[PDB]
From TrEMBL, chain A:
It comes from Banna virus. It comes from the Viruses. The chain holds residues 554 to 604 of 955 of the full protein. This is Vp2.
UniProtKB/TrEMBL annotation, chains B, D:
It comes from the Viruses. It comes from Banna virus. This is VP8. InterPro entries: Seadorna_VP8 (IPR026380). The lineage of its organism: Viruses, Riboviria, Orthornavirae, Duplornaviricota, Resentoviricetes.
From TrEMBL, chain C:
InterPro entries: Seadorna_Vp10. Pfam families: Seadorna_Vp10. This is VP10. It comes from the Viruses.
Length: 51, 298, 246, 298, 299
């Protein structure tokens, strides 16, 4: 009898990620401003890769 | 002659005549099914560290998405359930739930309205009358276990008549000391500690000697048809909650310490069959009320 | 072990015709039949477990030298697998088969005065299962028709209604009844875990049950080695010496 | 000197000695498992608006498809379960279920049949004897909670001896007024409302002052080994049903108001350990009988 | 005047003041959850004829693998739970469980330690005092249902006052014969068989006419906040197991026939609000103790 961590931080009962706010968090990055005071594609590029 | 009667068998009050039709019975059954799933989802959410099972269950029950900064009352179903419970208890209570609302809530699940599929055993001891001659004292105390205290101050032995009614199925008598009991126009057996009697056999005559007090403990079992989802432990919890919540306060109604006493007393009064039919529906509604109130206190 | 596996009236009657009386009796003293004793069952309780000894346990017990003792030993062998200790039965009786003792007049035994009610009490019929009671009634019916006491068998059955329900439906004289019988009298059979039961009867019965699977395969060669060059004891020819005490 | 004894401890009748082997125990455990599935399948069928779940469960239990015109009785498994219940109660029961029938019914599901892997607490209070001197009256009433009413009419204080047997684990005594109790050959402490005792300690002496009557309420707890599937709520309900259905209507038998009194009374007989194992098997059988009959009333 | 009172309400001993913080209540919540899974796995093992489901559940509970020749007792979690149960019962019980152990066991599962999600109904009837005049006799018997036997020996009718405290929500009185009961400075109604009373109304006066004794059967219901996992049937069984196992044998403590009487008696005392919070935690712990002991038994 043994135990092992489920890969990729997914709960089988929920069938989703452990964090319940991931969808809200990704949208927050998409509409954020990073690395510049002016507009840039850092927020949008990271959101696309995260999704 | 002196007559002794059980306290909870005296003057039953009329019960409600609304919310008895097939659509209404479906509503009570749906409420019981949805309320049970609500309390299971409460446990599952705690174990799985996510609120998804509770949100789905509450949305089905209350027709509203749960939100923070809300009391989580239960929605229209809780209000309908509460007002329907008041209607059953007394004929004086108003019926303020529209029929269209009950049918709409009954469509949230597909269950049968049958309330007589199964049975249940009810433990209240009905002692309709105990007839004693002069120079003797008889006292009856208790409902679940009736103790009858018997004293004979006369010169000789006395015959005392017990009448347990016709509704009860079996009655078990246990005496403090061995005593003598037989039906009318039957020979007296030897002294025995315990007796098993069918109440339909007729009045029972007990011989009381002159020496020391005799106490007889009585236990009875009665069968009443109930739906398969009936749970006596949950019904009792709902009965005490409804009484404490003030759902049973109305003019000219008797008050009982348990649903056991309520249903048995209603049975023994005139037109017994129809009253028990309504009381059984109240039991399922009370069962649903307990689970919804324990999941969503207010 | 072989007598308990028979599941039909035909097989049980065939076994009794082949088996001599020697295997029905036993040569071990044992203890007094009825006695309140404390036995050790450590699988369940630390304290000693109360029980009462009887003649249905598969353990030898002392029996008197009379027809009642011989009948009790035969029935115990059929319903339990082990007989009793009857001292000095004699060669003539031991060489006869069990069925001939029950159903034939050439054995030299009188059985006309047997009381069926007393035998059932002595054999503790109350603590018997359905199969054991049926086997006892088969032996009673055979003795009843042998001595002509068929009425007494019916009186005994009428006094004991539960036994009348499960009574065998065969007439000892007729053969059509034996051929068409449908009773299930098997006690031991191939299926149980290697565990201990509380009662003496239950524990001993389970010992036979667990040993039947092994006995099914090991008895063939070991038996044949024993009587490779041995004359059969059943109905052995002799000078017909004497029958003493009967 | 007078003797007072609890009514339910008098003359326990011998229990059956059949259907207590490993094969028969497995059959009872199988019957409980399939009876439970029968109840759940009925609930699933009602919720899902289909008869497929119930047809599968009834077919497994009764080895026959349900039919609209025919009555639903449970088949041979119901008859076997009914008959073994009668055999368990008394030694005079017919015990007419063949061994081949039991083995074929125990092969339906896989269960160990072990009736010793758990325990349950039984609340009957055993009062074997209460020894009182002259000019004193003692009366015992109740089995789940025993009230001992004592009256002193003599010149001085009286010594009353209580014997609680040697089986019960703990006994808690609460009096109407503070009183004195101590073991034999021990000094008496100050008057106290409550006492916690071990029945193995020995007979206990209670000092009864002259004056108002003294009532002592007794509560006891005893531990008995039971299977893991044992449920006291279901066993007690099944016990009442079997009495109402006449399964215990045998000659020369005693009667009890609950299963708790039955098992404790058989425990306190001469060599009571012999009967506890058989009584526990009857309880599990009564658990299966309850669930089956509630699903399939007859 | 003569005074009578319920036996179980006399001298409620103080309760423990330890392991009542957020971490400790989380540990008791985890213990109940893992004990419940231990019972279920034992059933699943038995219907399946495989020891795998039980071994896995025991490994979570005891953090060790079962081995033959070693008795399965629950490991460190059982040891901590038993000693914590003792500490809750009395203030004389020692506190011998380190905090690092409580934190370690609390992390074994992710459950909320909140003990006030739901409620429960308790049936003990509190009779604080019954005062009677000189020529009367009053006796009080019972806790689940109180039988008050009153005898009047004097010539005139007597007035007996009943006090039911301020904690119970409802009290129902039923008499062997119809009787008169009314609040202080209120007219007395016609003789009836039953009365429904709110204990906060005040002392109730019952007229006792001279003659045969009058017996009143009292039933009360009170509501106490409990966690949603609270099961009354399991708690009562755990209370009896703990008493029989001998872990309630502390110096200068009171003993009760049920957890119902224990919680009500502590409620009817000074600073009764704070005692009830500790007793609720002990109730959930008793639920865990019951399930664990049935899964892993001893003879």
């Amino acid at each position: 009898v043994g135990r092992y961590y489920n890969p990729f931080n997914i709960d089988p009962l929920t069938k989703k990620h452990v964090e319940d706010r991931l969808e809200e968090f990704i949208n927050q990055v998409q509409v954020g401003r990073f690395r510049n005071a002016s507009g840039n594609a850092v927020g949008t590029t990271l959101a696309a890769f995260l999704r | 002659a002196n007559r002794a009667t059980s306290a909870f068998l005296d003057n039953p009050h009329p019960v409600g005549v609304n919310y008895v039709d097939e659509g209404s019975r479906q509503f009570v059954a749906v409420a019981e099914l949805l309320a049970s799933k609500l309390i299971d989802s409460s446990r599952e959410s705690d174990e799985s560290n996510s609120d998804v099972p509770f949100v789905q269950a509450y949305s089905k029950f209350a027709d509203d998405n749960p939100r923070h900064l809300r009391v989580k009352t239960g929605g229209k179903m809780a209000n309908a359930l509460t007002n329907v419970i008041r209607s059953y208890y007394s004929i004086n209570a108003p019926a303020i739930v529209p029929q269209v609302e009950i049918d709409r809530l009954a469509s949230k699940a597909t269950v049968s309205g049958d309330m007589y599929n199964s049975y249940a055993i009810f433990n209240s001891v009905p002692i309709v009358e105990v007839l004693s001659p002069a120079r003797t004292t008889v006292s009856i105390v208790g409902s679940d276990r009736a103790d009858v205290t018997m004293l004979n101050t006369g010169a000789g032995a006395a015959n005392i008549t017990f009448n347990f009614g016709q509704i009860a199925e079996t009655v078990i008598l246990k005496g403090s000391v061995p005593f003598q009991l037989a039906r009318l126009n039957q020979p007296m057996p030897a002294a025995r500690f315990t007796y098993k009697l069918r109440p339909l056999d007729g009045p029972f005559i007990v011989v009381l000697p002159v020496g020391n007090p005799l106490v007889i403990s009585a236990t009875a079992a009665t069968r009443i048809q109930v739906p398969l989802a009936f749970n006596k432990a949950l019904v009792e919890s709902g009965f005490q909650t409804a009484m404490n919540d003030g759902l049973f306060d109305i003019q000219n109604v008797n008050y009982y310490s348990s649903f056991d006493e309520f249903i048995i007393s209603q049975y023994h009064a005139q037109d017994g069959i129809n009253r028990v039919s309504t009381c059984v529906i109240l039991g399922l509604a009370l069962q649903a009320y307990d689970q919804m109130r324990r999941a969503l206190p207010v | 072990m072989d007598v308990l596996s028979k599941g039909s009236l035909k097989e049980l009657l065939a076994h009794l015709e082949k088996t001599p009386l020697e295997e029905a009796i036993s040569y071990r003293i044992g203890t007094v039949p009825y006695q309140n004793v404390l036995i050790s069952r450590n699988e369940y309780y630390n304290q000693l477990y109360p029980d009462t000894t009887s003649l249905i346990d598969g353990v030898s017990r002392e029996g008197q030298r009379n027809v009642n003792g011989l009948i009790m030993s035969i029935i115990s062998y059929v319903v339990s697998g082990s007989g009793h200790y009857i001292p000095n039965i004699g060669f003539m009786l031991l060489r006869r088969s069990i069925l001939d003792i029950l159903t034939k007049h050439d054995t030299g035994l009188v059985t006309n005065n047997l009381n069926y009610g007393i035998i059932a009490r002595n054999l503790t019929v109350s603590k018997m299962n359905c199969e054991q009671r049926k086997r006892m009634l088969i032996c009673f019916k055979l003795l009843a028709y042998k001595d002509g006491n068929q009425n007494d068998y019916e009186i005994y059955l009428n006094q004991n209604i539960p036994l009348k329900q499960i009574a065998p439906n065969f007439i000892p004289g007729d053969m059509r009844t034996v051929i068409h019988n449908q009773d299930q009298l098997a006690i031991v059979g191939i299926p149980l875990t290697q565990s201990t039961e509380l009662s003496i009867r239950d524990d001993n019965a389970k010992s036979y049950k667990l040993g039947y699977v092994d006995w099914y395969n090991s008895n063939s060669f070991l038996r044949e080695r024993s009587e490779f060059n041995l004359i059969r004891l059943k109905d052995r020819d002799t000078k017909y010496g004497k029958l003493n005490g009967w």
